[PDB]
Amino acid sequence: PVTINNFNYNDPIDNNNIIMMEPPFARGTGRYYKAFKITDRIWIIPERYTFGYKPEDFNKSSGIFNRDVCEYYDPDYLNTNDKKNIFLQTMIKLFNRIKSKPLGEKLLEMIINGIPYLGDRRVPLEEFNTNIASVTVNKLISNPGEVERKKGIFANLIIFGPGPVLNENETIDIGIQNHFASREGFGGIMQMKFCPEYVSVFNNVQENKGASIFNRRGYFSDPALILMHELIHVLHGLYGIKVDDLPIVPNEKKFFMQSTDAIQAEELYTFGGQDPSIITPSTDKSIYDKVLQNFRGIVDRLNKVLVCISDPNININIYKNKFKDKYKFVEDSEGKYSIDVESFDKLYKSLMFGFTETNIAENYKIKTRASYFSDSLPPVKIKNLLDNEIYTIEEGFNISDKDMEKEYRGQNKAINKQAYEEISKEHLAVYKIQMCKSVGICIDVDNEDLFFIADKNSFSDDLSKNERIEYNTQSNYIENDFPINELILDTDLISKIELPSENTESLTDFNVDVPVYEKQPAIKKIFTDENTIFQYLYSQTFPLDIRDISLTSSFDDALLFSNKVYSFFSMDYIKTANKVVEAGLFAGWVKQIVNDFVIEANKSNTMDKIADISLIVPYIGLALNVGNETAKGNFENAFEIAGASILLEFIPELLIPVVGAFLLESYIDNKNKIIKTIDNALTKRNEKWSDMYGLIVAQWLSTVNTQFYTIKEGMYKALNYQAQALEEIIKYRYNIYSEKEKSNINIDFNDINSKLNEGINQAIDNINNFINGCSVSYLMKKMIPLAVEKLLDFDNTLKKNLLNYIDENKLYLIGSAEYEKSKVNKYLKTIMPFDLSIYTNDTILIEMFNKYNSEILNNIILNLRYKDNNLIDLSGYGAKVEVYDGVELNDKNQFKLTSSANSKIRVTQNQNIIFNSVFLDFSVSFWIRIPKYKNDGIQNYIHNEYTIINCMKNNSGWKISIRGNRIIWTLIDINGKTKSVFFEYNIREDISEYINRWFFVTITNNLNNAKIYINGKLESNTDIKDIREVIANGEIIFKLDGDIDRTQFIWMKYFSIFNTELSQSNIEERYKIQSYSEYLKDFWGNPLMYNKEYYMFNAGNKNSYIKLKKDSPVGEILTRSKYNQNSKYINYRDLYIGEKFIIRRKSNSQSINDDIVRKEDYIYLDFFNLNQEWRVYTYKYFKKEEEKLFLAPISDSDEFYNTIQIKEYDEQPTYSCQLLFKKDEESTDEIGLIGIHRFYESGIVFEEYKDYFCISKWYLKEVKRKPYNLKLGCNWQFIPKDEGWTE
Length: 1287
Ligand SMILES: [Zn+2]
Ligand SMILES: [Zn+2]
Known about the structure:
alpha+beta; Zincin-like; nine-stranded mixed beta sheet; metalloprotease; metalloendopeptidase activity; zinc ion binding
């Protein structure tokens, strides 16, 4: 096990466990340091790290060492013996906490046993040289004051206290002659600067730290995890695997980009979590290859080591045995050491992926930051880690015996306040960027606030290189993952070979490279007249010396006047917030303005289903003005058009290399080595696919998802500022009253803050769900497709490459040259689907991905919508749309295809979508209005089939065509095999629900069937087992093509395509979402208009129509006349009959031109009688359930109701509408609904029943029934003359 020693600072120097050490960076000179051996091979020196630093650097200055850290300075730390001892006692306690769990102890055991190899690159293979600064360190044995006697010792780790910046912990390695033994397999003495007291702070971005903003928020770090984080670097250094490779360097070309040091992969592996994914699979293998090569050298030396010049007392065997166990080398019965790939692999993965900060945090139930790239905060000071009441060895701060175990409560700042203290900002130093405008107003922005955008250089181009395929060549996949359980349960992970004695010859060669550090300006002034996120956030703040502010929607006034604060919330909200009231009305105003704030913030849950967007945060652009000038115009519209790309502050330039070529080695007269070279090139191809996706993901995570992170944090801020301004105003107005008045004002500020911070939290969750959605969308639509392209390009090349190979060897393949001929076409056919869970295992990211893929709307690969007199694809896949001069377009998203040759639309689809899933899986939905047949052209109508939408590529694909009253869906697989399904509507109906009327079509295709849906209802099905591969992404031509009549035309709307099969459920919903409108519709399905002539139709009496009775002011109901000719193919009732009505507006007298009729509108229902315009009226004084309507010239009578309110009681789609008579707008007295009633007439001559145009109260209760009864006599539809219907 691991034994932790005990001692006090003042304990006597015994030259064994309490020595006088000569530190590695002292160069064999200077004074010694009282060092204590906390454990074998590990020393603690409770003194400030001063190597490379100037004495004055320890004081806070106008400079800083690291640009990405809030640096704390305090030169008095450890300046007394008691302070040094408290340090020792804390270190001892932290180590005990560490070994308190199997994982932590094994980490300690690996470190104690991971003794540096004796010597480095310089040392001859045959030797062991201990006289080098990275292997040996001296201790002064002799009496005080005289360095007369020295003793050498072996060591693995020396831990010092902090250097200038206390919260800047660092593991340092020993370089000698520009080389590091710790980076070449040898290993070497590792050093560290560490501070247990002043720990870092962080807060889960996509979450609320104690659901508080007006409260302290975020969590503070557990010093034991901080220590283990450094201990992991030590582990790496001790095993000589701390190699350097291609680093993640940040782009710094723009003022909004975050400046920082290059980040090595070793760092990201140490942190763990998702960061490893930022290291492409290419560089993962590189690093692996370097380390393995490093171990080959060591394993070779162990076979050649014969002596140790530096120390004749060294026992060569004991050391060969130790090293053999360290590097897990294997040994035969002779003593020949060699590398076992298995054992090496497991050791490598253990060290780079098992021991990570994330795994360790999860294991010790300690909470930590969610990513390497996450805004750093001011550190806090831990009161007393030595008091078992605040921090214990077993649980740290999360002591269950204080209900501090659950949810990491012990580390929650807003909860465990008696455990820490904030720090004097006067001792903190932060690198700032001073953004100045050419004038000059300037603002300070902490480098941590800017966007971290990885530079293109950060990524490897190893994909663009050629690869020799041989019967050997195999797949190379490195798992940036490890099973922490096995590691914890590993029997032979922890060596059981005795550790060599640490005493040895003194060091005489003190040669070593000592780093020199120095502060750099903490402020960098830049010039820009831009007003982006930083400026917009700034305009929402106000000075401490100011207490009277007012809100404004004017960003420019907010920046100018100190007493003005910018607000991205509504105009009404802003007025109410600036409103001053009487003390007696203050409470009420507080309730109101607060409630309003919540409403405004909650607009973050806005839906936009009609534009196929389930969630949109409308105020994001006004709040931050991030990306492409998002504060201007309507954000929602802008988002509908360009999507997530508009929110990005910068569009990266991706690295998507042309996959290098393949070199297949031929084996003449050889059936195996040849077939192998084939299979291996096939599987290698798959590795190129997986690897290319890794490169994409790594780039997404460090150039795109980081920007969206900043946006999320910007919104958290924006919202908080608003809450702070309203807070400031409420306090101000309240304090303007006298104490007497205040006593009678009932107000509770904790409450106000609660309601406010609550609304903030609801919006934060919306905003996060929204932004993550945008991030995943950008990955899938703007990145993955660009990779797929190249990967496909690669495939083809490799295709002819393998075919040309299976050919040159045709002979040696004999009766199979044709078998593995297809075996190649059948493999290079199905492409590898992108799956994020492969390139990472971060729970948060996987969830983002799964959520994205569960939302059907993301399966839209084409969505033609109108925008500025044109049609464009808004699916976000970039389809190029060509609309020619013959296509008629309007803002109701309707387009007309005529018989003219120039009436066509050309759509070039995106070839880079996993469309060809191999069995045809996709859907097409759209609305269409097909004109009525010309009665004299009935023969050709039922005979000529004409294509309307054609999508072919290599004689394969789909097509939509029309033959009279039938719409047909046709598929043609690669084998030319044709299949169809169709929907035909009846053309002998008195009243058709389809002829010349807008209706919704949806066609779904899966492996088995082809289904046609009409208005959500399934109408037709076709078994399509046969039909093989169908090339569905060819060019799409929208044009009438066939033997048509010059007058033939077709109107279309909302054409879109999904690369999946829509369910009846999805389709029903789409129908309802696209049927929705605030206005009513006419018979054909178009918007209802004012001042437009219409004949009336009654859904309850289809074959009836209204005629003004000759003798009386009543409207009689007569039977519609029918189709007169003799065709056996057609029958219908006349629609252009009865009175010609016209709907007139009631309110605002803005003449009688034309406009749209909306639900709940008040209107006059008039009609034309000869040269006059008459009106529909209701005699005010009837007492029966119903009565006949009064029709007469326009006039104002005291005895008649002349005002109607157009209604819509049906919740489901319908072109029917109802007409209500009320006592008057404001009233709630419902006179009745217009309909048709049957009366009995018995005169001196005639005796019969007759229906009249009436009004009935009876309808009032029928319209409430569910399902809505469409057959009620109160349902009407307006039929205007339409070129699409002639009779
Ligand atoms: Zn680190
Ligand atoms: Zn960062």
